[PDB]
């Protein structure tokens, strides 16, 4: 069996430059025969399926843009895009077709852009989720960068920990920033037991984190 | 030109079958070759199988004898069979057209299949309205909240997609089972709530589809 283990990981890097992976097969993907070798690259965007880029090691696909380049033989290649543009964000794999197809781990590039702040919205419980038993607060940090970002939610001014499920949003590809949603889940009981509910997005571009909240009253 | 659509279950239990469908457009599934690729939640590809235009089959070592492939070229069709199901045949499923080495490779959107006993259960969607007099500006998000269902997927899209611009649909979290969602959507105060916002959530697995408008809290 081939294995194809690709590198780096994951790669960020700012709009215009120009970046590289390494795809390195188990053995020699070059067969004497068609004298060709047998490797393709395949991109994914966030949320779509994947398209080939290239075939044999180095021949562009039918609309595939310049600035990305194949190389190599036998058993190491690389990829290259000239300028990395914003649409480029996703992840990208190589694929082996001179035995039973094998797929690299993947390569995720992503895009560097300036700080930016959440834009935060608190959300108490619907009025229809409490008929159910059920009181979840909802809060939304949008368009910020860069991803790690921190969220504390703090019922009646204490810090509570159980209850909380967090998403990330993929990179935006417009605006190279991320969103999340923070969500405290209670029960209609411990809910309406207190007061004071907020939601708390302590980030590196501000000293002081970003705080909204209300009070059901 | 060239489509390919994949239909399968979406929940199918351990140790039961999944029988998955590849219907093409615009080509003959004799002159092309049509392969399986699957991809588990957050992780890498793994091809599956091809079946070649003369017929022949190959499959991928893994699943040496619990993955078949067919095909009907009067129903313009391909099927991928799995037996003796795991866990970790959760994946989304895609068949793509292939050629020997060339031009051509082009990948369906792929289908979502989890293999669980767990019973599929539809969700509950609630309004995320504003805190009615809190916060007035230039911008206003509002959200949907679609918890306690499985499996996934769920789709979410604002005024039966006319609003797509400033969405944020979150992914999903799995909470004891059970999964979890939200989705923000951020416009004008000149719009809401003079004209009107409704988030559309379907549920495929269900069979269901839920509307509801965002009103004034
Ligand atoms: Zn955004
Ligand atoms: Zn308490
Ligand atoms: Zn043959
Ligand atoms: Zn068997
Ligand atoms: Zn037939």
């Known amino acids: 069996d081939i294995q194809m283990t690709q590198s780096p990981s994951s790669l960020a890097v700012s709009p215009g430059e120009k970046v590289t992976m390494s795809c390195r097969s188990s053995?020699?993907?070059?067969?004497?025969?068609?004298?060709?070798?047998?490797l393709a690259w395949y991109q994914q965007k966030p949320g779509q399926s994947p398209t080939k880029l290239i075939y044999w090691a180095s021949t562009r696909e039918s609309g595939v843009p310049d600035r990305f380049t194949g190389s190599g033989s036998g058993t190491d290649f690389t990829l290259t895009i000239s300028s990395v543009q914003a649409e480029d964000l996703a992840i990208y794999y190589c694929?082996?077709?001179?035995?039973?197809?094998?797929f690299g781990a993947g390569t995720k590039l992503e895009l560097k852009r300036s700080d930016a702040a959440p834009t935060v919205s608190i959300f108490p419980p619907s009025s229809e989720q409490l008929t159910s038993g059920g009181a979840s607060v909802v809060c939304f940090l949008n368009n910020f960068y860069p991803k790690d970002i921190n969220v504390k939610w703090k019922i009646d001014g204490s810090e509570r920990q159980n209850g909380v499920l967090n998403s990330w949003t993929d990179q935006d590809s417009k605006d190279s920033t991320y969103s999340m949603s923070s969500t405290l889940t209670l029960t209609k009981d411990e809910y309406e037991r207190h007061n004071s509910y907020t939601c708390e997005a302590t980030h590196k571009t501000s000293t002081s984190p970003i705080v909204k909240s209300f009070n059901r009253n | 030109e060239v489509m390919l659509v994949e239909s399968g279950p979406g929940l199918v239990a351990p140790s039961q079958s999944l029988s998955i469908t590849c219907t093409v457009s615009g080509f003959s599934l004799s002159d092309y070759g049509v392969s399986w690729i699957r991809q588990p939640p957050g992780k890498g590809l793994e091809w599956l199988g091809v079946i070649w235009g003369d017929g022949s089959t190959y499959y991928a070592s893994a699943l040496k004898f619990r993955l078949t492939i067919s095909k009907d070229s009067s129903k313009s069709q391909v099927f991928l069979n799995m037996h003796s199901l795991q866990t970790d045949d959760s994946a989304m499923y895609y068949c793509?057209?292939?050629?020997?080495?060339?031009?051509?490779?082009?990948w369906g959107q792929g289908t979502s299949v989890t293999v669980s006993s767990a019973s599929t259960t539809p969700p509950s969607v609630f309004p995320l309205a504003p805190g009615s007099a809190a916060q007035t500006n230039s911008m206003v998000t509002l959200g949907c909240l679609v918890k306690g269902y499985f499996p996934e997927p769920v789709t979410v899209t604002w005024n039966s997609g006319s609003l797509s611009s400033g969405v944020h649909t979150f992914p999903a979290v799995l909470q004891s089972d059970l999964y979890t969602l939200s989705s923000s959507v951020t416009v004008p105060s000149s719009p809401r709530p003079s004209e009107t916002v409704t988030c559309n959530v379907a549920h495929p697995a269900s069979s269901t589809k839920v509307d509801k408008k965002i009103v004034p809290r």
């Open positions: 694929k082996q077709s001179y035995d039973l197809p094998t």
């Open positions: 793509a057209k292939h050629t020997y080495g060339g031009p051509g490779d082009s």
């Open positions: 053995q020699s993907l070059f067969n004497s025969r068609t004298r060709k070798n047998y």
